[model samples]
Target chain A: GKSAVIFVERATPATLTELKDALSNSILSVRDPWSIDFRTYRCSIKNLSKLMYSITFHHHGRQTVLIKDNSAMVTTAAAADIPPALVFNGSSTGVPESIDTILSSKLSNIWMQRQLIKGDAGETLILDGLTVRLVNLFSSTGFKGLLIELQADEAGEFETKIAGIEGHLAEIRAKEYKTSSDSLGPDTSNEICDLAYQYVRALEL
Target chain B: VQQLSLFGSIGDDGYDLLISTLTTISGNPPLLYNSLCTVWKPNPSYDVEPNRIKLSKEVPFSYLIDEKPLNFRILKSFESCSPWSLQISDIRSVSMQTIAETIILSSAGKNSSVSSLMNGLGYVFEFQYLTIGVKFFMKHGLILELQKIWQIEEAGNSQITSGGFLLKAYINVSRGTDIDRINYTETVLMNLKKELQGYIELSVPDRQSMDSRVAHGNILIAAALEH
Candidate 1:
C-alpha cells in the first residue's frame, strides 16, 4: 500500500476541525457511507548506549530501527505470534520468550525511551481506491496533535496520489507541522517499511 | 504432551501385509502424509565468546540453557492434507511405567520465511530429510503410521535411507501430569502390541538411538559408536 502522512499541530485553531469537516463533507456528499472505527499504538525504544532507536508500530506489524550515526533505518515486520522485540536480540541460541520476560529480564540493550504514542477519536474513511485516516495523537506528556494518513490500493506514485489532499490542505491553509521527508526507495518488500518510516518521521520521535 | 509409543521395523515385503492388517483392525483407510523436515542448529561463527561477558546482574534466558547447539525442526510441504508441524521430542523417559514415555512439543503452521527467521536467531541449516507415510487412526486415540524415509541429496535426488518400513504405534496424552490418561494410553498401546503378537512384533527401540540432541566433545564420538 502506498501511503502519505500529514501532521497538524494543536497550536493552530479551527484548522483540524475544518479539515475533518471538509473530509467528512466530501465523503457524505459523494457518500459511499463507508467508514469504520480506527485506533493504533506505537512504542519507541532506544538502545541505552547506542545511537539506534526502534519503533514498534503495531498497526502494520512493522518495526523501524533508525540509527542516527548514518541516518540508516531498517524496517522489518514479523509474524504476530512472535514479538517485535525479538528482532533486537536474534543472536540468542535460546528459545523465544515473551516481551515481558525480555523487558523485565533487563538483559537486552533496548529500553523504552518515550511514552507510548496512542490514538484518540480515530477513524478510517474508505474511498474507491483510497483510504484516509484521521487520528488524534496523544502521549503521557499531553495531547500531541492530529495525523491524517492517506493510503492508496493502486500501485503508483505516492506523491501523485497525495497531490489532491496536499492541494486541499493548501487551500484551507492547514499550518504544516511536519511532512514525511525521506523518499523510501522502491515498493518491493518496503511498503510496510516505508509506511512505518513515514509515521516515525511525522511523529518526530 | 506425553507420548506412549512402540516402534518396529518390517521389510518391504511385509509392509503391504501390515497395512492391510492395520486397515482391517482399525476400520479406516490410510491417510497419506508427506513432508520435508529441515534441521537447524546454532550458528557458531561468532568470534567473541559473549558467555564470558558476565558483567550484568542477570543473563538472557537463552544463555541459561545447555551450550550444545540447540537444534530445531523446520518442516515444509504437505500443507493441503494436514497442517505442517514441528515436533521436538525429549530423550525417552527412563521410567518403566510405559514402553516409551517421551514429551514432545508440537507447534503448527508458522512456515513463512522461517529459514531467514531461524538464521536471524543464530541457527544455521544443518540437513533435511523426507518422510512419506500414511497414518491410520484407531480407537482410544491410537495412531499407527507406516513410514518410508529418504535422505535428500543435491537439488532433486534422494535415496531410501531406512531400506524398510518403519511402523510406529503411539497415543498422545494431552498432559504429562495426568496419570489416568497416561495409564489409559499405555494400556491401549500395549493392547495393540498384544493383538499383533504373531503378525508383527512391536517393541521399543533403544532410547539412545532416538536421541536428537547435538553431541559435542567425547559425547560426539560416543554417539558415533552407539549408532
Candidate 2:
C-alpha cells in the first residue's frame, strides 16, 4: 500500500526476461489484458479552452477519470477561492457553467478525439527488495511506443533502492530535459503525455 | 494583521493552495495589537477556514473568500491571464452552492446603497484568477516552491500593476556548493531588496526569513492600529 512511481521513457523492453534479469530479485507476474478508452477534447471556441486529455481508471475500485495534468495546476476548486470556476473531476461528464463563462460565445464548437488501447493489467514484480507494479504500455498498446512504468509508494527505502538502481541500470538510460526559458512553461505537452500513456493502455487491451 | 497572509502547504501533488486573511480590528485590542508584537506568532480570531476551523499552520491559497466582520471580501483577488482553470463542484467538506451564494450577493445590488441588497435566488458567480509561484528543488535536497495567487478583480494589488506585465518563471537550477554565492529569503523582502538574477534579486529564503517576515508583519499591523 505504499506510494509508487519510477518512470522510464523511450524504452522498449523486448521481453520480461530482460527486465527480470536486470533486477535478479524480481519474479515477473502478469494479469489478464485490460482495455481502456481515451478521449481528448477541446471547446470549439477556438483557443478558448486549451485542449485537454482525460482518461478513466477503474483500478483501485470504481471508474475515475484522471484529468492527466501533472503540474502546479489546481486539481480541485476551493469553495472560498476568489474568481471561481467549475471544478472538473473523475465524475464530471460535460462542461460546467464555469467553463461556459470562458467559452460561452462559441459553445457549439466542442469536439473530441478518441482512441482505444487494450493492454494487460495486474502485473507485479519486486524492485530493490519491495513490491512494485508494472503496467507495460507497448504490450498493452499494439507496440506503438514504450510506456513501461515501475511504481511503489514514494516514501521509506524505495528511493534508497532507486538511487542504486539508477547507478546499476545506468545504461537503462534515464534522461533529463533542459529547463525552459523564463516565459514559457515545461516543455512537455498534454498530447505527448497522453500518447505516452496510450502506448501502455493499448498493451492490456 | 490587516495585510495579506498566506497559510498552507503543498504535497507531492504539484498544485499548491494558500488562503490569505486580514486581521480586522473591531475593538479587539489583542487582535489589533498582536500582529505588531515583536516575535509574536498569532492572528486575529477572524481568520477561520471554510468550516470556521481556526488556522495555526502556514497554509497557502490566496484567491479565496473568508467571512469577517459579517461582510465577506475577496482576498488576493486580481487580474489574471489564466482565469479559472480547473474546478470541482464540491471539495468534500465545502459545497459549491454555498460558495456561489456568498459571491453572488456581493456587489450586485440594484441601488447604490448597501441596503438595496436582496435575498436573491438563482444567482451565478463566475471567478477568474491567476497563480504566480517560484519553486526551487536544489540537487534533490527537496521539492520546494513559493507560490502566490491573485483574483482578477484586485488589479491594483501591486504598484507594477499599472506599468509592467508580471513575469513569472520556474527556474530549474541545480544546487551549487559555493558558500559565497547569494541566495533568496522566504517572503521576498520588500522596499530595499527583491533577490533575483541581478544586483538586487530573488534567491531562496534562509531559515529565519519566515520569522523575520512575521516579525515585520506584526509591526505593520501595529502601525495601522495606531494610525
Candidate 3:
C-alpha cells in the first residue's frame, strides 16, 4: 500500500494568525486567577505537512517568573519538580544576633532591592530606633523644659518606650541632659526623644 | 699630604666627641676608639678666613630635666563646655577663652620651668583651643570667616598663605598631645617648629587680622599671667 502526502506550499496571513490565536487560547484555558499559584502557559506550533503538525505547550505555575529559552523544556521540568518546602531556605539563614548589626548589613540589601525595583528616584523612610527617638526629643524641643515635662508624665508611653530600648536609651538621654545647659536657649530634647520613640515603636510592629 | 693629615686629625676629634656624648647620654660605654670619621680639605686657591675656618665644636643642643606640665583644666573646661557645640551654636568666645587661659598659665612659670612652659604653651596656644575653636566655628557657619581672614592683604602679602590652615591646625593639635606624653623634647620641638614654620608660610597669604588678634590676645594673657 502507498501513502499519499499533500504539502501546503505557504501559510497565508489568516492561516498563521489563526494558528497563533489557537495556541494563545490553549495557554489561557489552564490559567487560574483565584489560586495563589499563578501559572504562565506558552505554546509553539509548526505546520509540517497537510495533516502533520508540531505543537509544544509549556506551563509554569509559581510565584516567581521563569526565564524561557531553548533549554526551557529541561528547565521547566526541573523547576516544576522542585518541592515547595525547599523553594526558600527557611533555615541556615538565622536571625542576626544584634539588631544594630543586622540593620547595618540588612539596610544596604533592602536599599539595593528597593533601588532595583524603583530605580534612582526612590525615597526611604527610616524608622528611628529608641535611642534615636530620645535624641530627637532633645532636637524637637529645648532640652530642660521638654525633658522635664516628659519625666513628669512618668509611667507614660514615652517612659515605657525609653525603658524598653534599655541602656542605649539611657546613655542618649544622659548626653542630651548634660548638653542642655539652662543658659543655652530653648531645648528640643523631649520632642526629639518622643519622635524617636514613636518611630522605633512603629518600626518594630 | 699635610692637608690629609690635618683633615684626619679634625675628623678623629669630631668622631670622639660624638661617641662620648652618645655614650654618656645612652649610658652605654664607648665600644671602640675612632668608630667613625669624615675628612674634608679647604679649597686650595681660596684662603679660608681664620674665624670662619675655626673648628666649631658644637654639641647638638641638649636640655637637662626638660619638664612640661599640661594645664588640662582650661582645655577640659573648654572641651566639656562646647564638645558638640560646633554642630549646634557659635563657640568662638569659649574657644578664645580656653586659648587665653592656656597661654597665661604657661607664661607664668619661672626660669627652670620656662622651656617646659614654652613647650606646653605651644600646645596650649597652637592646639588646646585653636582646633576646638576652628571645629566649632566651621560647624557653625564660621568657615566664611576663615576664608575672609585668609583673603586679607596682610596674609596675602607674605610668601606663606592660608591654604592649608586646617591641616596645620590638625597637625598642631596632634603634635601637642603627642609632645605631652613623650620625653624626647628636642625632637618634638624641632618637628613642632618645622610645622609652625610651614603654618606661618601658608598663613602669610591671608591678609586678615585674625592671626594678629589671636597673637595680641595671647600676649595680653601672657602679661596677666606674668604678674
Candidate 4:
C-alpha cells in the first residue's frame, strides 16, 4: 500500500496551463488508480470542547469506509495545532477509538467542511529523491486538482526531515497508511515550492 | 574481534553497596535525580566535581620524556566504594610527557594523592593502579567488566575487592594471546576471581561474536561488547 500527501487549492484550466508552461509545457501523463476518497469535518460540542474527525471512503469494489474518529482542542485555525501536533502513525495498533456506527447521531456538534480529496494513482513525479503520485482531489465546494506525494523514496525521511517550516515557507501535511512499512511516522514537511512547482508541471490532471 | 568474560568473585551484600550509591544521592529527595554521564576527560577542573565521575593519579609524578617506564600507577586508593576500587589508566601506549604535566598541575591541588585525587570523583575512566571497574546499568543493577588490555610481565599488578550487589563479577579477553580471559591463571584476575567467586558462573556477550576473531593476538575494548 502506498501513502502520500500535500496541501492544494482549487484550480481552473488556466492553473493547469500555467503549470505546464512552468516546465516548458512538457506533456503530462496521467492515470486513474483505486484510491480512498476522504473528507474531514470539525465541530464544537455543547459547552464542552471543539473537535475534528475524518471519514475516508474506499471505492475498491464493494465500498468500505475507514474513519479517523479522533478529536483535539481547537480554538482558531491559526492556533489549531500549537501543541506538538497529534499524529496517528499508521503502523501502530491499539483499541479502535473509531466507531463503525454514528454517521447519524442526535448528540450533536454543528459540522463544517475541513478537507475533501480523492485519489486513484495517476502520474508519478520524481520529487526531491522521492516518487510522488499525482492524483486528482475534489471537494463539494467544487475544488479540483492533483496533489503531490513523496514516493520515489522521498517519503520516508521526508515526513520528518524536510517536511517542516523553514526558509519562511509555511505548513505541510501527510496521511497514514495501513501497512507495516508505509506506516512510518511521527514525521516532517518542508514548504519546498521550487520542486513542488515543477511537479505541477509534470501532472496531467 | 572476539569477546569473553573474565569472571570475578563477590558476596551479594557488598554489591548492593555500589547500587544504592551509584543511582542516587543519599540525601535531598534521597535518591532524587541522577547524573547522566561519566566524564572521561583530561582536566575535570574545567567542569564541576560532582559531575565528574572519573579521576586518576598517574603512576610517576612526572618524567623528562627521553626514556621512561610505561605509565602504570598503583591503585594507592579512593572513596565512593572502598575495598575493590582500583583504577589503572593505560597511558603507556597513549602518552608520557603531558601526563607528567597533568601530574604537576594536579599535584598543586589535593589530587596529588590517590585519595585526594579520587575525591568526589566517583569512577575513574583511566582507572590506573586498579584492576576492577564497576560498570553500572540504570534500573538498580550493576555489572563488573574487567579491562583485559594487560601489558605487564608480572602478576601482583593489583588486587580489586568486590563492592556492590553484582549481577555477576566478570570481565573480558579475546583470541590468540598468552592470557585471554581463559588464561586468567597468568594474570592478577585469577586471584581476584578466586577471592570473589567461590561458586558463580560468568556469562559473556555471545558465542559467534567471540568466535569471529580471526587474528588472535589483540583487539579493541569495544569489540568485546559487540553483539
Q: Which candidate number maximizes TM-score?
A: 1
RMSD of each: 12.6, 22.7, 35.0, 24.0
Model 1 lDDT tens row, B93-170: 211221111111111122214454333333466655555566788998677767655555567645342445666677
Best of the candidates, DockQ: 1
- Per-prediction share of native contacts kept: 0.00, 0.02, 0.00, 0.00
How would you encode candidate 2's per-residue C-alpha lDDT over B1-227 as one tens digit per residue? 00111122222222212111111211111110000000211122322111110101111233233333311112122210122222221111100011111111112112211111110100122222233333232221212223333333334532112211122112111223232221221122221123222322322223253235322322111111221
Stretches > 4 Å off in candidate 2: A1-17, A24-39, A60-62, A68-111, A114-118, A126-129, A138-141, A153-156, A167-205, B1-227
- For candidate 4, give the lDDT of residue A51: 30
Of 2 and 3, the candidate ranking higher by lDDT: 2
Model 4: CA > 4 A from native: A1-4, A13-36, A42-44, A55-102, A105-129, A144-146, A152-205, B1-227
Model 4: per-residue Cα lDDT over B76-112, one tens digit each:
1211111111111221111111000011111111122
* i-RMSD values for every candidate model: 15.6, 18.9, 39.9, 29.3
- Please give the lDDT score at residue A31 for candidate 3: 22
- Complex DockQ per candidate: 0.04, 0.02, 0.00, 0.00
By summed lDDT, the worst window of 10 consecutive residues in model 1 chain B runs over: B48-57
Model 2, residue B189: what's the lDDT? 23
Better of 2 and 3 by TM-score: 2
Q: Write the per-residue lDDT of candidate 2 for residues A1-205, one digit (tens) a residue.
A: 1222333444454433345456664544543333333335452332312344434333332121222222111111223333322211111111222322221222223333334443345355654455544444432345533333334345366456545545534544535211111111123222223333332243322
Task: Report the TM-score for the A-chain of model 1.
Answer: 0.60
